[PDB]
Homo-oligomer: A and B are copies of this chain.
Amino acid sequence: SCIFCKIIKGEIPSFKLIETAKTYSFLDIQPIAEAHVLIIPKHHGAKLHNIPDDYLSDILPVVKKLTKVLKLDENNTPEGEGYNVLQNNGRIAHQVVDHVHFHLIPKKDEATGLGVGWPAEATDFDKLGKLHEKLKEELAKVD
């Protein structure tokens, strides 16, 4: 039933851009900015951790090549127009289609493109230290 798998299989049309042996990209037909692009692995998995590594390695090179296509790569200064790369995992994180997809979203002004809510907390070395200790312990056992 997955609509992105249907896009890949040519059963739903799409404004196709770069296609790879592993990766498929196309214009978002519900964009939030002018050339809003989606980039998906051909391996169906709902979240990032469901994608094999060899599919994951292919995504950012394709995204970076798309920035050449959209000419976003002509601005090598922090000012002027910019862009975001965003991938969502779960309803609460704003994912609706349950197949991994990266958004390449040009940021031309404040009214359009991604709007970033950034609720940052103060630095607290004691809590970070305890969190680092716990995460390094989970890392040791992943290895």
- Report which A residues bind B (CB closer than 8 A): 15, 17-18, 27, 29-36, 46-51, 53, 56-61, 63-65, 67-73, 75-95, 98, 102, 107-123, 125, 128-129, 131-132, 135-136, 138-139, 142
Residue of B nearest to A30 (CB): B120
Query: Assembly of this chain: how many copies?
Result: 2
Q: A56-B60, A81-B90 known; A131 and B46 CB under 8 Å? A: no
Would you call A116 and B139 a contact (CB within 8 A)? no
Q: A139-B18, A142-B65 known; A90 and B107 CB under 8 Å? A: yes
Alpha-carbon distance between A70 and B132 when the two chains are bound, in angstroms: 11
Alpha-carbon distance between A85 and B78 when the two chains are bound, in angstroms: 21
Would you call B93 and A135 a contact (CB within 8 A)? no
A and B contact pairs by CB, cutoff 8 A, 18 listed: A27-B128, A31-B121, A32-B120, A34-B131, A46-B78, A47-B76, A49-B72, A51-B60, A69-B142, A77-B90, A79-B91, A79-B92, A82-B90, A84-B88, A84-B89, A89-B107, A93-B113, A94-B118
